[PDB]
Ligand binder design. Sequence first.
Ligand SMILES: C[C@]12CC[C@@H]3c4ccc(O)cc4CC[C@H]3[C@@H]1CC[C@@H]2O[C@@H]1O[C@H](C(=O)O)[C@@H](O)[C@H](O)[C@H]1O
Ligand SMILES: C[C@]12CC[C@@H]3c4ccc(O)cc4CC[C@H]3[C@@H]1CC[C@@H]2O[C@@H]1O[C@H](C(=O)O)[C@@H](O)[C@H](O)[C@H]1O
Length: 1375
Amino acid sequence: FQNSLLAWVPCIYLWVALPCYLLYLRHHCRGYIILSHLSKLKMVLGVLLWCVSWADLFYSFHGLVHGRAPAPVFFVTPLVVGVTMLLATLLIQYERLQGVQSSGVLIIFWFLCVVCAIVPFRSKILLAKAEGEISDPFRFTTFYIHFALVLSALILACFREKPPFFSAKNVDPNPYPETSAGFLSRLFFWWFTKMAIYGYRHPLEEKDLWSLKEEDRSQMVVQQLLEAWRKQEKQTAPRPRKPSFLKALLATFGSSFLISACFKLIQDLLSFINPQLLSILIRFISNPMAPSWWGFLVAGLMFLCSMMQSLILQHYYHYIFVTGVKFRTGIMGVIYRKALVITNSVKRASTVGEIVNLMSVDAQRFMDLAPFLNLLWSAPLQIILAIYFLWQNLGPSVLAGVAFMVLLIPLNGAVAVKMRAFQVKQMKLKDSRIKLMSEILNGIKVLKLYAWEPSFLKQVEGIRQGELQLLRTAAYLHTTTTFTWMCSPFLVTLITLWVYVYVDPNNVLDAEKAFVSVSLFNILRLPLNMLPQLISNLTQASVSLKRIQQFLSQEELDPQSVERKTISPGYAITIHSGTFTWAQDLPPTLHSLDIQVPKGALVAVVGPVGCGKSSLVSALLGEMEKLEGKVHMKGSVAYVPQQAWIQNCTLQENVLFGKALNPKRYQQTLEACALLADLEMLPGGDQTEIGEKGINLSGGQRQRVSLARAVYSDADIFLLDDPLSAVDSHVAKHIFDHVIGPEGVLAGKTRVLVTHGISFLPQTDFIIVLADGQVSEMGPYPALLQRNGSFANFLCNYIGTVELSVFWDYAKAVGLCTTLAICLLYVGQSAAAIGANVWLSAWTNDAMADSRQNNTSLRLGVYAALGILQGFLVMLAAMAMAAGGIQAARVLHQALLHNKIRSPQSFFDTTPSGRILNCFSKDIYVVDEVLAPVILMLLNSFFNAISTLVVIMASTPLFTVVILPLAVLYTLVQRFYAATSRQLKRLESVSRSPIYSHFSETVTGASVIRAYNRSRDFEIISDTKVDANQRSCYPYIISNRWLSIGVEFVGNCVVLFAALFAVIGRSSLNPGLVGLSVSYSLQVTFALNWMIRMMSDLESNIVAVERVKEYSKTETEAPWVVEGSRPPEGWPPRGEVEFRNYSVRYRPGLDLVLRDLSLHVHGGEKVGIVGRTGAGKSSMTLCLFRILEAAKGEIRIDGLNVADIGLHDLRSQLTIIPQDPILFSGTLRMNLDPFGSYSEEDIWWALELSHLHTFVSSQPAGLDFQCSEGGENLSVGQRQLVCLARALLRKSRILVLDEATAAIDLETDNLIQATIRTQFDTCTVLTIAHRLNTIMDYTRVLVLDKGVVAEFDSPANLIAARGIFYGMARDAGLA
Ligand SMILES: C[C@]12CC[C@@H]3c4ccc(O)cc4CC[C@H]3[C@@H]1CC[C@@H]2O[C@@H]1O[C@H](C(=O)O)[C@@H](O)[C@H](O)[C@H]1O
Ligand SMILES: C[C@]12CC[C@@H]3c4ccc(O)cc4CC[C@H]3[C@@H]1CC[C@@H]2O[C@@H]1O[C@H](C(=O)O)[C@@H](O)[C@H](O)[C@H]1O
């Protein structure tokens, strides 16, 4: 304060200039100054002046070493200049979105900046240069740079701004509240409040999100990127390398990535202020003479400079996540414009699944790279400028310090890539298990209709046990991610202290280096343990951008192949010298073809299969490339692919397909195609969802849908490529009569047809034959009838939060003896760490007057033995918790499965089995291995934060009052976030998939999308469907920030109230305890924002356990073993069946199926049940095996009831032929005997009796032959022969046949009936009536009427009585 004390003229000015002036920017609202690059320069030069105002500040702090404490006004005024011009930069950025033609105050700002500088300048311009050479070199260079930059600021402020052209108040949806938001309210992210309130008192549905801001509508961002890629042309203005996606991607985000480097720089280069004020405070309290206001100022400025660096960081993640989302959109939308205009040979070259995999992967790989990408230059600058401080403050003993972190990184990458093969590439066991789960789910019926369930229980338990034995070795080595985060700080401190002590004996320890080091390492190791993730994402994203660049350099034949301007009059379809080839390396399918077609007539193309008929239509659409020839298409086009294309939406727009709904015309098209017959089946009618979403409409129906689309779209030329392949003749003829032919609606259309039919030919106006891709004849049908030349060839040829109870339940799964040995053991480890630190504190203070310094050889020792325990009593937690997790997964899966098979048939009847299949796939993988590490890290961060909040308390025992707000505010903000972020996570996960589902539907229908020139009006459906994703992924990004302003505010009030309370009790403390209490208070604002990044992430994964508890306790009601009351065995041979008024229904509350049925059956009595087909005799078959339980009456077999026996002993003594013979996927060994209890000779003998011995003998392995999924690789007759072989093996004395003639071939049905007559002559046989011809043979027959018996009699006598049996026998034409 000698001559430059006046430098405070500008600063305080702002603190009165800002508020009063700011109101002028609020009374007038919009303004919207346009951004000229002069504004960008005005911004960035402020940042440069800021960095020099940092350089002089750390030159002032350099005085800390070499002897003196800094002079009073040296470490205050540069740091107020460097916050005032930060405010200047922020105000520039804010008026960038305002409307001031000129400031009127910032002008005075710069004027006074020059005024307060020239007078000091005039006093040293000649008083320091001619006197010598030194002239306070750094302090003078600072003035020189400041002078140059302020002169630039003045000359840039001499300008004037353009007229506001402010705005027009267009619409009032929910606007994205960054526009129309005060500067002070867009700094603390406070404008999000008005939604976080509504995210906790209400549910959120899509209509209540932000209406996305006008900059990004997914088509003003893909426009820029696509144009930049266009700038990568051949560049008319070396090695062929012209394609360069990276250059064009970089050249369109400079204004959003170099604005996001003037924040990370300011932040990290600013965060090194706290580890210097800490040394200042420690040095202060060590001196009991300095006035207390010095300490108060240092504390109150520590808080400010540790908050304003926490507000130019949590205001940087916003700008570096919005850019990630902009990547994820700009690529998802430029991958699309190419996917619409590919050449179908390229589509042949790959699979549509991987064309999708260019999204959800390789394009979602970005936005997972943007947060880390900026770290490339931060990692050195946050190291080489943080190694300097330690090497300046602990001597060259920090070599080992950072060396341990550097060594850790490869040893944290190796045992993270070992999992990339030992934990994901060994999960083919999971795929086999889920395929087996789908195998035993689809077909559970037949498996339950008789025995063999426990065999499959064991056969899935084997793979479960194997894969869990694997995981025992796959989570044990997942305890190297807790080792880092809760042993690297302590261990590196131990190593560096040990080396520093034992390098020389005359460099004694003291607080102002040990504690500043232990607090500066904390700053060092956040942007150093997130380095392995960077080095992995760079690899797995450079592998991705390579593939994206590859897929974007392909072939497009759109520009011109079939011109549409000049057409010969009187002709509509004309080709001259038409040569068409599918691929340049393929033979030419069509050779110099010359086809001319008139206007409005009918033309068809005939010939052998694939001789050019399935290629001409492709060539006409311009899809197929041409070597020579001229084609002239006139007007609109319609095209019906052989493989119908159906959009995953409602049928009405699947037929409307983007045109105005004409009602009468729409129903005319619907009725002409005769879709009404199918339409009546649809529940929602024309508004029913269609496609992958729901019912798999038959190709014979989807072809009708596509034809209706074509005819409604009333184009002028129709192309038909075998549109009646699965459409039956009786309906196809009417389709042609009402639509295609001149008698149809399309009389005045230039229709073209590709056919394999015959009766369609005679009424055709014009026929062209084709063969070998070369035309051979042409003309009207009679011209080809009499010739019988080329035509003869084909003439002959053809939501609330989870309740706490669930958590306890999970603990019960882990085992209380373990889950009570973890929380206790973490308490132990926290005690060990807090003891180690409070021991280091008592080590530091000893050096003040220690007259026996040899004691320093002891403390260090016990330090190791006080933290190695903590470095070993957390491994005993992580290993034990991994073991508990795998054990809990084992027990939970065992219970879920072991209970689900036993569930009654009704459950699988009502449940859409695929939902059961999502479990064993997703809702148990989550429980298995993405919930135990989450437990580890949650329960680990919690005990890392309790250690801090207890150590600060124990060090400075007086700030107990302040912890009450520091808890109530924290829990309040955590509750609000846990509501809103969870809601948004759900609402974004819901809408993520429909993007990918809308893709994989346009690549396949690439050709169908064209030929209606609807491609252009089809991106506007793609981009709106990613806009509906973005508007639920922006607020998530600005809801994970508004938390970290209500957290990194508490985590800094705890720094203010640690330092200030240390100062207020200076006389009662020592430097060691204060260094401890401040060094860990500075560290808590990270270990307390890391305890919400997971305590609100586990809340979205514990739900899995919830589901695995809802899919249980489902009334097994199937006691298989009642051994105390076994029936006497060996009662097939008696073979007596006796119903006694047995009354049964499907479910309690459902209709009554059977009504007091009674019967009298003896051994060998072949009996069939007759009645009305569809009455539910299958229900009676199910009752025989107790699939449905009676409410009255019972079934007595040989004097033995069915309700007093275990289910398996019951079902084992019977024999069934299921109506659908299923074939378990795999060998024939288990498909005949999963238990393998029947010898090879018996099985071969029975297969000989099965009359499939020839086919299996022809097979190489015979019984070891592999069966495809659902037994698809064997013929139908083979399936029935397999099921009857299954029946033959067991060979009981009771048979009950079940409708083996649903849609089963008769040629093998004769064999089945003959066999079951032959070998089953000594067994009681039931039979369900699907045919009256073959039931005229059994000795006796049951007559049944939906639950009431009529008689037991022979068919010869039943027709004589002239009853229902006779009526139905006569209705079949047999009497
Ligand atoms: C990258 C993350 C943010 C920044 C942290 C970070 C920054 C810099 C740095 O050098 C190191 C680290 C360490 C770990 C990083 C966090 C992991 C998940 C999160 O990533 C995103 O967070 C978003 C949000 O809530 O804003 C979520 O919305 C997104 O879904 C999520 O992907
Ligand atoms: C980033 C982590 C989760 C969140 C914590 C966090 C969040 C927000 C925040 O502001 C600060 C911090 C501090 C440290 C962060 C953790 C370190 C490793 C972990 O990240 C790991 O990555 C693993 C992988 O994908 O291979 C996954 O298993 C898990 O996500 C996890 O184990």
